[PDB]
Design a protein around this nucleic acid. Structure first.
Ligand SMILES: CC(C)(C)OC(=O)N1CCC(CCCNc2ncnc3c2ncn3[C@@H]2O[C@H](CO)[C@@H](O)[C@H]2O)CC1
Ligand SMILES: [K+]
Ligand SMILES: [K+]
Length: 546
DNA sequence: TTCAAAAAGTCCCA
DNA sequence: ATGGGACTTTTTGA
């Protein structure tokens, strides 16, 4: 559970907080890392501080105690008054203690301010000038349940529902940061857009001044780690300034060590830079350049409806054990199952633009099985092969579900109707019309149009605009970026997409029906579909005035 | 009773 | 062996 931050990022974060520190004015800066590990950040802090003191050793000697300020005394002064570290791992602190001690060449047994503790429970006796480092990330599934109760009770300002452990480290860092202090950390990027991060975003915006945000998007910063990273730099300085430097990466395929320093990367064409007024941040942080802000605001103002206004959204089936209930449509065991129980089953990859692939899997809607005596063959030979795992599901342990029932079987009538489906994680907008009463797991989301909006919006019109290049860019402006070429397509953002209705409605709908007709042909003239899409994008851009 | 969010994703291969 | 690409379960708080 120890993750190594790349050196180029560590050096950037330390320089970000210390490069303009006035060591003459304050020769006693407290620099802290509350998840210091073996000292990836703190050992670099020592080097930066040592050069800082040695460069002004004669100025300090003249201004202050001239016997105290010598070069030979810098090592002791840094460890006594400047470097602070905390980490839950006892071995890590022991290694870091040796590394700090070995920075020089017993004399007086210098004390080092290293604490082996839970940084979220430690009674911190004072505040700190500078805080740097890389907190632990633990999501809602992997976090220990007894610990979560403590977080939900004591960190409720930032931690509710499906929040993450690193939310609480943001709160702790902000709380123990001195007035006028500077904090700089690398964390997952997801809180910038996620629904769970709403409270954390409010806490940051209303308690610190966010100096800078470096968004690496889907770039792989930690080798062999499936996480997407950002660097946040904030202060508690009294300033009329309210603008954030945002550095957004332009190419996710880059390797982080192109230059000797990170700031060479940021100033280069590999990144784009723009400013955001912190006072203009709503509960959402829309961090885009001026052209995209103009683009986004044009669509928002022009569109009088949202998907949430006109549609009913729902998540797919959650069986709780797919292997027990999902079978290949050619499996001989389906001869045991009455066709009244079988539903068509698709995965996220089966969703294309405008249409769904033919299903290859079947779902046993086991909720319709009355008792274990009438359909013993289905239970004994198919579902019962996983009875132990099925019995461990939460609702089976409480008795709410029978061991053979689907955990969250939803309502069949919601799936057995004309509806629009889209994958939950995709590189692009892929909204399809489902004609085949397809069921799916939670990797596919569905919606249908409310009865009172059927005379204003058709499914054919909706998939037309939703799959357009305009709406692909439009959705991605606020979408949750997960990994390289993957965005979350979840209702908490998809249903906030705004839609319009104007004079181009009939032609847009007609072009969509032509596309659907071609896509359903045996000899798909796939080429003409692209041309029809280009014409539709022109109509949509004409409609939205972009 | 029953919804929907959550990548220190997961897994495979050249 | 690693790095990159294809693809995505069920646990969980509310
Ligand atoms: C099952 C599993 C997920 C493994 O566990 C848990 O469900 N618990 C773990 C314990 C607590 C969390 C304690 C938080 N308080 C911590 N206080 C100080 N340092 C910490 C803390 N957590 C992690 N570090 C350090 O951060 C670095 C990560 O780079 C490492 O050097 C790591 O040692 C929550 C419950
Ligand atoms: K003096
Ligand atoms: K990534």
């Amino acid at each position: 559970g120890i993750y190594y931050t790349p050196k180029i990022i560590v050096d950037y974060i330390v320089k970000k907080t210390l490069k303009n520190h006035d060591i003459i004015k304050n020769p006693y800066p407290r620099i802290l890392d509350i998840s210091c590990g073996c000292g990836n950040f703190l050992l670099e802090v020592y080097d930066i501080l040592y050069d800082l003191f040695e460069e002004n050793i004669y100025e300090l000697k003249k201004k202050y105690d001239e016997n105290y300020w010598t070069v030979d005394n810098i090592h002791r002064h840094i460890l006594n008054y400047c470097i602070y570290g905390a980490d839950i791992d006892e071995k890590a602190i022991s290694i870091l203690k040796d590394s700090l001690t070995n920075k020089k060449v017993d004399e007086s047994d210098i004390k080092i301010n290293l604490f082996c503790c839970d940084s979220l429970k430690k009674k911190w006796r004072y505040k700190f000038d500078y805080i740097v480092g890389n907190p632990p990330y633990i999501g809602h599934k992997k976090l220990e349940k007894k610990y979560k109760k403590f977080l939900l009770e004591k960190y409720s300002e930032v931690y509710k529902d499906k929040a993450d452990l690193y939310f609480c480290f943001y709160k702790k860092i902000i709380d123990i940061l001195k007035q006028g202090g500077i904090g700089s950390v690398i964390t997952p990027r997801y809180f910038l857009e996620s629904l769970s991060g709403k409270d954390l975003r409010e806490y940051i915006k209303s308690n610190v001044n966010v100096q800078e945000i470096v968004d690496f998007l889907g770039a792989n910063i930690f080798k062999n780690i499936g996480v997407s990273s950002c660097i946040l730099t904030f202060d508690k300085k009294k300033t009329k300034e309210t603008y954030i430097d945002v550095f957004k990466i332009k190419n996710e395929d880059i390797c982080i060590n192109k230059f000797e320093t990170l700031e060479e990367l940021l100033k280069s064409s590999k990144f784009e830079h723009f400013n955001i007024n912190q006072r203009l941040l709503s509960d959402e942080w829309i961090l885009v350049n001026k052209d995209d802000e103009t683009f986004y605001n044009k669509i928002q103002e022009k569109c009088k409806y949202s998907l949430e206004d006109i549609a009913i959204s729902f998540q797919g089936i959650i069986t709780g054990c797919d292997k027990a209930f999902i079978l290949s449509k050619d499996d001989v065991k389906l001869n045991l199952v009455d066709d009244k129980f079988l539903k068509c089953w698709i995965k996220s990859k089966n969703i294309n633009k405008y249409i769904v692939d033919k299903s290859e899997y079947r779902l046993i809607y086991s909720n319709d099985i009355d008792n274990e005596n009438t359909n013993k063959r289905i239970l004994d030979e198919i579902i019962g092969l996983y009875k132990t795992k099925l019995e461990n599901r939460r609702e089976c342990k409480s008795g709410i579900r029978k061991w053979y029932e689907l955990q969250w079987g939803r309502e069949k009538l919601f799936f057995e109707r004309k509806k629009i489906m889209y994958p939950y994680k995709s590189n692009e907008n892929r909204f399809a019309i489902d004609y085949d009463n397809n069921f799916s797991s939670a990797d596919v989301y569905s919606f249908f149009i409310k009865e009172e909006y059927l005379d204003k919006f058709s499914y054919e019109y909706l998939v037309g605009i939703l799959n357009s290049s305009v709406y692909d860019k439009y959705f991605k402006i606020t979408a949750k970026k997960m990994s390289k070429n993957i965005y979350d397509y979840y209702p908490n953002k998809v249903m906030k997409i705004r839609i319009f209705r104007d004079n181009n409605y009939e032609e847009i709908e007609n072009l969509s029906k032509q596309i659907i007709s071609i896509l359903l042909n045996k000899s798909i003239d796939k080429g003409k579909v692209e041309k029809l899409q280009i014409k539709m994008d022109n109509l949509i851009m004409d409609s939205l005035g972009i």
